[PDB]
Amino acid sequence: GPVWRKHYITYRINNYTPDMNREDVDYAIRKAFQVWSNVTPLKFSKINTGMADILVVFARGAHGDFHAFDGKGGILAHAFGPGSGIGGDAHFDEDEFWTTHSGGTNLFLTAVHEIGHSLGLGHSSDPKAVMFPTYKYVDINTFRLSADDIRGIQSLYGD
Ligand SMILES: CCOc1ccc(-c2ccc(C(=O)C[C@H](CCN3C(=O)c4ccccc4C3=O)C(=O)O)cc2)cc1
Ligand SMILES: [Ca+2]
Ligand SMILES: [Ca+2]
Ligand SMILES: [Ca+2]
Ligand SMILES: [Zn+2]
Numbered sequence: 001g002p003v004w005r006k007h008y009i010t011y012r013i014n015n016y017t018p019d020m021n022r023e024d025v026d027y028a029i030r031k032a033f034q035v036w037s038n039v040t041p042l043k044f045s046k047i048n049t050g051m052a053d054i055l056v057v058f059a060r061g062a063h064g065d066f067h068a069f070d071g072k073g074g075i076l077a078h079a080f081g082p083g084s085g086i087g088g089d090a091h092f093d094e095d096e097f098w099t100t101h102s103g104g105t106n107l108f109l110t111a112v113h114e115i116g117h118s119l120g121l122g123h124s125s126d127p128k129a130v131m132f133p134t135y136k137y138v139d140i141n142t143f144r145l146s147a148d149d150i151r152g153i154q155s156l157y158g159d
């Protein structure tokens, strides 16, 4: 339902999981945003200080937003749809072991999914869609949004 009422969107990574190298975390997030900017008019800018539309945070259990994480497994992360304050923010359960590839929960793939929510997309029934409600691992270098994912994000932002 909610949508960002602009095309220039900013994000900021509040903290970094010790699971990965700082650079790998920044890259995974940057790449996830580009997945969406590539098929819409949306342009994402990363800020290292100041307010951002989308705040990326790694945390375990209760972290202040009333939706406490649940330990290893189960919910891996969560995000809030477009809106002020908490709206748009993407949180990742530190109790998961974040990885660049298959050695655990893939940050890149998870981020693409969560940012979809940050942009206003809900869950699809299409098993091929990244917005499908259940996590799935695939070779990150050959990852591609499904036609359903594209249709959904373009009906919201065009292009
Ligand atoms: C080719 C790769 O395909 C993939 C497809 C799906 C996923 C994937 C990644 C993470 C998760 C989760 O951690 C579960 C998490 C649950 C909470 N959660 C939300 O934040 C949310 C926002 C908007 C609508 C519904 C929900 C919702 O149920 C949630 O649904 O965000 C679930 C699925 C990862 C990769
Ligand atoms: Ca969890
Ligand atoms: Ca926000
Ligand atoms: Ca961790
Ligand atoms: Zn949270």
Ligand SMILES: [Zn+2]
Pocket (backbone or CB within 6 Å): 113, 117, 123, 132, 133
């Ligand atoms: Zn989801």
